[PDB]
Amino acid sequence: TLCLGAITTLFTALCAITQNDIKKIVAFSTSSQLGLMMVTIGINQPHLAFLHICMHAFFKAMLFMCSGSIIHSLNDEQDIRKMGGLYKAMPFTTTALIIGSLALTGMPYLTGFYSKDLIIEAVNMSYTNAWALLMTLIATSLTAAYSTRIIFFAFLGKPRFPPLVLINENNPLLINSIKRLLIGSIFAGFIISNNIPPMTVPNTTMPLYMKMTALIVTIM
């Protein structure tokens, strides 16, 4: 299980960093995260895998919803090469996608931190295959890589879409849906973590450099 998860997450993250369809990038991110869950199952933390599933549902669904809003606005276009500057054209969609990408990449104290940080720190502190450890670290870096790829090519720069601009996200249904999933992706990690019994034994003693390893590789 550990080896299968490690190869899955590394390969999918390596594939995702060069895709041009936004939906394909998001799908490959889901596949890599499933590989990570299989990894954490392989080192005997099933409750961590369940917690990660619960945390991942929120921001993954909301990332897909932001992608769908972008697609519908730009006359059913999915290629990131034809999306220009939507940071100012799409305030709410940009903010939602930024929060989602930060939560996916384990920004501390967001919903993704409370599972991914523990998973990485528990993989580091275990009698485990070294190759799987290395591939897990490289995969968690490539996660940040494809997240910033999506952000850079979708929101920054000058427009590249056809000149008949039909951008409009001012619809109550879309706004309410993404707002609900945003509240979830911001607060659900803390709310759920502080409300379950302790089903694991914590790693209270860590070398200082190994405590921030996920943060370091994400920044890199």
Binding site: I53, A61, M65, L174, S177, R180, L181, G184, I196
Partner: protein, 111 residues
């Protein structure tokens, strides 16, 4: 009678009502998507209760409510596990589904 079991079973039961109503004069009107969304939202708010019960007392149950068949020494019954995983996963899926249906009401308007 420890509403845990009744509430957790009604949570799943109330999701099947729109399937039954899919042959009435509501599946042919433009109010069907909102009706389904409201049903899912109500199911989520109802399933929020067993989660609070589990967080409070760690309460867990199994419900073997219908005996389907019995082989010679093997008995098959319609049984449900309402442990930590079920009571924690059901509300999350219901919340995500509610938000997705509300989004689809606008995304899929021209279908």
């Amino acid at each position: 009678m420890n509403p845990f079991a009744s509430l957790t079973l009604t949570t799943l039961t109330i999701l099947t009502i729109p399937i039954m109503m899919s042959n009435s004069n509501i599946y042919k009107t433009n109010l069907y998507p909102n009706y389904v969304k409201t049903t899912v939202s109500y199911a989520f708010t109802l399933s929020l209760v067993p989660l609070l019960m589990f967080m409070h007392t760690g309460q867990e149950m199994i419900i073997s409510n219908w005996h389907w068949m019995t082989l010679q020494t093997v008995e098959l019954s319609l049984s449900f596990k309402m442990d930590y995983f079920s009571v924690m996963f059901i509300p999350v899926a219901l919340f995500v589904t509610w938000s997705i249906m509300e989004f689809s009401m606008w995304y899929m308007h021209s279908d």
